[PDB]
Write an enzyme that holds these catalytic residues in place. Structure first.
Site, PDB file in Angstrom:
ATOM      1  N   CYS A 195       0.848  -1.177   0.000  1.00  0.00           N
ATOM      2  CA  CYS A 195       0.000   0.000   0.000  1.00  0.00           C
ATOM      3  C   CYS A 195       0.906   1.257   0.000  1.00  0.00           C
ATOM      4  O   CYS A 195       1.919   1.244  -0.748  1.00  0.00           O
ATOM      5  CB  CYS A 195      -1.088  -0.118   1.089  1.00  0.00           C
ATOM      6  N   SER A 196       0.688   2.261   0.799  1.00  0.00           N
ATOM      7  CA  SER A 196       1.679   3.348   0.966  1.00  0.00           C
ATOM      8  C   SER A 196       2.792   2.979   1.960  1.00  0.00           C
ATOM      9  O   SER A 196       3.946   2.867   1.570  1.00  0.00           O
ATOM     10  CB  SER A 196       1.093   4.683   1.304  1.00  0.00           C
ATOM     11  N   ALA A 197       2.383   2.669   3.193  1.00  0.00           N
ATOM     12  CA  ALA A 197       3.375   2.315   4.256  1.00  0.00           C
ATOM     13  C   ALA A 197       3.684   0.774   4.257  1.00  0.00           C
ATOM     14  O   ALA A 197       4.719   0.324   4.813  1.00  0.00           O
ATOM     15  CB  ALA A 197       2.983   2.816   5.635  1.00  0.00           C
ATOM     16  N   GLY A 198       2.793  -0.061   3.700  1.00  0.00           N
ATOM     17  CA  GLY A 198       3.036  -1.507   3.650  1.00  0.00           C
ATOM     18  C   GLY A 198       2.704  -2.274   4.968  1.00  0.00           C
ATOM     19  O   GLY A 198       3.273  -3.357   5.164  1.00  0.00           O
ATOM     20  N   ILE A 199       1.740  -1.698   5.736  1.00  0.00           N
ATOM     21  CA  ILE A 199       1.359  -2.318   6.992  1.00  0.00           C
ATOM     22  C   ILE A 199      -0.185  -2.390   7.272  1.00  0.00           C
ATOM     23  O   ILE A 199      -0.663  -3.319   7.884  1.00  0.00           O
ATOM     24  CB  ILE A 199       2.089  -1.750   8.262  1.00  0.00           C
ATOM     25  N   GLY A 200      -0.934  -1.387   6.813  1.00  0.00           N
ATOM     26  CA  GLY A 200      -2.353  -1.243   7.124  1.00  0.00           C
ATOM     27  C   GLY A 200      -3.259  -2.005   6.146  1.00  0.00           C
ATOM     28  O   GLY A 200      -3.697  -3.188   6.374  1.00  0.00           O
ATOM     29  N   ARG A 201      -3.532  -1.368   4.987  1.00  0.00           N
ATOM     30  CA  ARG A 201      -4.288  -2.155   3.939  1.00  0.00           C
ATOM     31  C   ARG A 201      -3.658  -3.444   3.525  1.00  0.00           C
ATOM     32  O   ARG A 201      -4.279  -4.492   3.319  1.00  0.00           O
ATOM     33  CB  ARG A 201      -4.527  -1.278   2.684  1.00  0.00           C
TER      34      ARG A 201
END
Ligand SMILES: Cc1cc(C)n(-c2ccc(N)cc2)n1
Length: 298
Positions: free
Chosen positions: A215-221
């Site tokens: 995703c953007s940070a690679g942890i949430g979605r």
């Protein structure tokens, strides 16, 4: 006990925030020394989102081996995933080098390049067939072969070539283009249809390297995708699919990358996704679309 009856009780009590905070307090902590070296500052999107040393993916080229990317190895479910940040303008070459070296077939994208007027990821793949991309630093060429644009997601066929050898590979790009600006999707139907298309492509099979998910940070979605997939695999493998405790699976995943699932809403969505996905697999088609009231709220 049954996942669906636990869900009802958590909704009635309004206790999603408390459960999510328990997860945060219980989660593993391991060192991220390499991520924090001063020469790697411009290779991280955020100071407080880093891969652990023990699970980080190493680049093989002669040069700095550092990328913000983690290998999640789920031994009971028999699947692995690479979770990574959306590439930055200066790490697009590093990203494709990782895809190459780890032998991945698929790339899963859960964001748009621009959201709410701000840049969330670089434009790391070509938009037009006739305008290929060359990554000079890692000696890679990438061409768009075709794409199929649907209402909730797009699927691309890309050709990745190692210019050092002239070897070529086909890579599948699965892009979920409709994640809301705020919060999480009302219904998990479109997310599930997307996950099932990924599975159907063969990209998660053990013939290949791990799928790359971002995703953007690679942890949430990103976390929601991998958590839903793994819980559904465990429900099919276990004698009692009600044995599956989403919270215990998530703490397991958090041994390999910090911060997976970043809000109580993401936690509730992941449960909703697994419950509906299991129903669908077991023969209930009523979960595959969302019913709409006639309204003009906008
Ligand atoms: C752990 C574990 C056991 C197996 C077979 N995998 C695996 C790795 C990569 C893919 N694409 C699928 C599966 N990971």
């Amino acid at each position: 006990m049954e996942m669906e009856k636990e869900f009802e009780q958590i909704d009635k009590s309004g206790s999603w925030a408390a459960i999510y905070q328990d997860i945060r307090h219980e989660a593993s902590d391991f060192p991220c020394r390499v991520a924090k070296l001063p020469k790697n500052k411009n290779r991280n999107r955020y100071r407080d989102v880093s891969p652990f040393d023990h699970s980080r993916i190493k680049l093989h080229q002669e040069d700095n081996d550092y990328i913000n990317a983690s290998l999640i190895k789920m031994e009971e479910a028999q699947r692995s995933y690479i979770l990574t940040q959306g590439p930055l303008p200066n790490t697009c070459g590093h990203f494709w080098e990782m895809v190459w070296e780890q032998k991945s077939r698929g790339v899963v994208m859960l964001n748009r390049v621009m959201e709410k007027g701000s840049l969330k990821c670089a434009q790391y793949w070509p938009q037009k067939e006739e305008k290929e991309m060359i990554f000079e630093d890692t000696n890679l060429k990438l061409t768009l072969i075709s794409e199929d644009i649907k209402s909730y997601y797009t699927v691309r066929q890309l050709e990745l070539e190692n210019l050092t050898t002239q070897e070529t590979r086909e890579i599948l790009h699965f892009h979920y283009t409709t994640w809301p600006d705020f919060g999480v999707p009302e219904s998990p139907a479109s997310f599930l249809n997307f996950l099932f298309k990924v599975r159907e492509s063969g990209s998660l099979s053990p013939e290949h390297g791990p799928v790359v998910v971002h995703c953007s940070a690679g942890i949430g979605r990103s976390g929601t995708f991998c958590l839903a997939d793994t819980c559904l695999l465990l429900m099919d493998k276990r004698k009692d699919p009600s044995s599956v405790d989403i919270k215990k699976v998530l703490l397991e995943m958090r041994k390999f990358r910090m911060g997976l699932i970043q809000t109580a809403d993401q936690l509730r969505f992941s449960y909703l996704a697994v419950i509906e996905g299991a129903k669908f697999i077991m023969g209930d088609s009523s979960v595959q679309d969302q019913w709409k009231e006639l309204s003009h709220e906008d």
